[PDB]
Protein backbone atom coordinates (compact mmCIF):
# COMPACT_ATOMS: atom_id res chain seq x y z
CA UNK A 1 0.00 0.00 0.00
CA UNK A 2 1.25 3.48 -0.89
CA UNK A 3 -0.05 4.77 2.47
CA UNK A 4 -0.33 3.03 5.87
CA UNK A 5 -4.13 2.69 5.80
CA UNK A 6 -5.62 -0.82 5.93
CA UNK A 7 -9.24 -1.37 6.99
CA UNK A 8 -10.95 -3.82 4.62
CA UNK A 9 -10.97 -2.26 1.15
CA UNK A 10 -7.21 -2.06 0.59
CA UNK A 11 -5.89 -4.74 -1.77
CA UNK A 12 -2.53 -5.82 -0.36
CA UNK A 13 -2.47 -8.96 -2.51
CA UNK A 14 -0.41 -8.30 -5.66
CA UNK A 15 -2.41 -9.44 -8.70
CA UNK A 16 -1.04 -10.92 -11.94
CA UNK A 17 2.28 -11.85 -10.26
CA UNK A 18 1.69 -14.77 -7.77
CA UNK A 19 5.46 -15.07 -7.13
CA UNK A 20 5.11 -13.85 -3.53
CA UNK A 21 3.04 -16.95 -2.76
CA UNK A 22 6.19 -19.11 -2.55
CA UNK A 23 9.19 -16.76 -2.16
CA UNK A 24 8.86 -13.88 0.28
CA UNK A 25 11.75 -11.40 -0.19
CA UNK A 26 15.31 -10.79 1.06
CA UNK A 27 15.55 -7.29 2.55
CA UNK A 28 18.45 -8.13 4.87
CA UNK A 29 21.92 -6.66 5.02
CA UNK A 30 24.58 -8.97 3.52
CA UNK A 31 26.68 -11.33 5.63
CA UNK A 32 29.02 -9.61 8.06
CA UNK A 33 32.44 -9.20 6.46
CA UNK A 34 34.20 -10.01 9.75
CA UNK A 35 33.28 -12.36 12.59
CA UNK A 36 35.92 -10.84 14.90
CA UNK A 37 35.61 -7.17 15.93
CA UNK A 38 39.35 -6.63 16.48
CA UNK A 39 41.34 -8.95 14.19
CA UNK A 40 40.78 -9.41 10.46
CA UNK A 41 40.81 -12.89 8.93
CA UNK A 42 39.62 -14.17 5.56
CA UNK A 43 36.70 -16.58 5.27
CA UNK A 44 35.37 -18.06 2.05
CA UNK A 45 32.17 -18.74 0.15
CA UNK A 46 32.69 -22.41 -0.69
CA UNK A 47 30.91 -24.76 -3.07
CA UNK A 48 28.97 -27.77 -1.83
CA UNK A 49 29.74 -30.40 -4.48
CA UNK B 1 14.01 17.66 1.48
CA UNK B 2 11.38 17.08 4.21
CA UNK B 3 8.58 19.42 3.13
CA UNK B 4 4.89 18.82 3.81
CA UNK B 5 3.48 22.21 2.78
CA UNK B 6 2.09 23.60 6.07
CA UNK B 7 -0.98 24.89 4.23
CA UNK B 8 -2.06 21.23 4.16
CA UNK B 9 -2.25 21.25 7.96
CA UNK B 10 -5.07 23.80 7.67
CA UNK B 11 -7.17 21.66 5.29
CA UNK B 12 -6.35 17.97 5.96
CA UNK B 13 -5.16 17.19 9.49
CA UNK B 14 -5.31 13.40 9.03
CA UNK B 15 -3.45 13.39 5.70
CA UNK B 16 -0.81 15.66 7.24
CA UNK B 17 -0.46 13.24 10.16
CA UNK B 18 -0.07 10.25 7.83
CA UNK B 19 2.47 12.01 5.60
CA UNK B 20 4.44 13.41 8.56
CA UNK B 21 4.75 10.42 10.88
CA UNK B 22 4.69 7.45 8.46
CA UNK B 23 7.18 7.99 5.61
CA UNK B 24 6.82 5.70 2.61
CA UNK B 25 10.26 5.05 1.01
CA UNK B 26 9.15 3.52 -2.31
CA UNK B 27 11.43 0.97 -3.94
CA UNK B 28 11.54 -1.50 -6.82
CA UNK B 29 12.62 -5.12 -6.55
CA UNK B 30 12.98 -8.27 -8.60
CA UNK B 31 14.39 -11.79 -8.66
CA UNK B 32 16.77 -13.40 -11.13
CA UNK B 33 17.61 -17.07 -11.73
CA UNK B 34 19.97 -18.57 -14.31
CA UNK B 35 18.58 -21.74 -15.92
CA UNK B 36 14.81 -21.60 -15.37
CA UNK B 37 11.95 -21.08 -17.81
CA UNK B 38 9.78 -19.98 -14.88
CA UNK B 39 8.68 -16.34 -14.96
CA UNK B 40 9.41 -14.50 -11.70
CA UNK B 41 8.99 -10.93 -10.52
CA UNK B 42 11.20 -8.37 -12.26
CA UNK B 43 10.22 -4.77 -11.46
CA UNK B 44 7.66 -4.85 -8.67
CA UNK B 45 7.15 -1.74 -6.55
CA UNK B 46 6.70 -1.71 -2.77
CA UNK B 47 6.82 0.85 0.04
CA UNK B 48 9.00 0.11 3.08
CA UNK B 49 8.23 1.38 6.59
CA UNK C 1 -3.71 -1.02 -55.49
CA UNK C 2 -6.64 -3.41 -56.17
CA UNK C 3 -5.14 -5.81 -58.71
CA UNK C 4 -6.16 -9.45 -59.09
CA UNK C 5 -4.36 -10.29 -62.33
CA UNK C 6 -7.24 -11.03 -64.75
CA UNK C 7 -5.29 -13.99 -66.17
CA UNK C 8 -6.24 -15.74 -62.92
CA UNK C 9 -9.92 -15.51 -63.91
CA UNK C 10 -9.12 -17.81 -66.84
CA UNK C 11 -7.50 -20.53 -64.68
CA UNK C 12 -9.06 -20.35 -61.18
CA UNK C 13 -12.60 -18.97 -61.05
CA UNK C 14 -13.16 -19.88 -57.39
CA UNK C 15 -9.85 -18.42 -56.18
CA UNK C 16 -10.60 -15.25 -58.14
CA UNK C 17 -14.03 -15.06 -56.49
CA UNK C 18 -12.54 -15.49 -53.01
CA UNK C 19 -9.79 -12.92 -53.59
CA UNK C 20 -12.17 -10.41 -55.22
CA UNK C 21 -15.17 -10.43 -52.90
CA UNK C 22 -13.62 -11.32 -49.51
CA UNK C 23 -10.60 -9.09 -48.79
CA UNK C 24 -8.32 -10.19 -45.97
CA UNK C 25 -6.77 -7.13 -44.23
CA UNK C 26 -4.02 -8.86 -42.21
CA UNK C 27 -2.99 -7.29 -38.92
CA UNK C 28 -0.86 -7.96 -35.85
CA UNK C 29 -2.01 -7.57 -32.26
CA UNK C 30 -0.84 -8.03 -28.70
CA UNK C 31 -1.62 -7.33 -25.07
CA UNK C 32 0.47 -5.58 -22.43
CA UNK C 33 0.14 -5.52 -18.64
CA UNK C 34 2.36 -3.78 -16.08
CA UNK C 35 3.01 -5.91 -12.99
CA UNK C 36 2.31 -9.50 -14.05
CA UNK C 37 4.64 -12.45 -14.55
CA UNK C 38 1.98 -14.06 -16.76
CA UNK C 39 2.95 -14.44 -20.42
CA UNK C 40 0.33 -13.03 -22.80
CA UNK C 41 0.10 -12.63 -26.56
CA UNK C 42 2.57 -10.18 -28.09
CA UNK C 43 2.68 -10.36 -31.90
CA UNK C 44 -0.17 -12.59 -33.04
CA UNK C 45 -1.42 -12.27 -36.62
CA UNK C 46 -5.09 -12.30 -37.66
CA UNK C 47 -7.12 -11.39 -40.75
CA UNK C 48 -10.12 -9.07 -40.34
CA UNK C 49 -13.21 -9.21 -42.55
Q: What is the 3-state secondary structure (H, E, C) of chain B?
A: CCCCCHHHHHCCHHHHHHHHHCCCCEEEECCCCCCCCCCCCCCEEEECC
User: CB of B26 within 8 A of CB of B5?
Assistant: no
A14 touches chain C (CB under 8 A): yes
Neighbouring-strand partners of residue B47: B26
Percent helix, strand and coil across chain B, each to the nearest 5 = 30, 15, 55
Which residues in chain B touch residue A27, judged by CB atoms under 8 angstroms apart? 48
DSSP 3-state assignment of B44? strand
Distances from the Cα of C19 to the Cα of C1, C23, C48, angstroms: 13, 6, 14
Dihedral sign (CA C39, B34, A20, C35): negative
Q: How was this structure determined?
A: cryo-EM
A10 touches chain B (CB under 8 A): no
CA-based end-to-end distance of chain B: 18
B14: part of which helix (H) or strand (E)?
A: helix B13-21
Amino acid sequence: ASEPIFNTSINLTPPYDDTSHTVIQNLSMPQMLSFDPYYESTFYVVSAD
Amino acid sequence: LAKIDATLTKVDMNAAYIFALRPTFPYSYGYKQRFSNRRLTTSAVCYAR
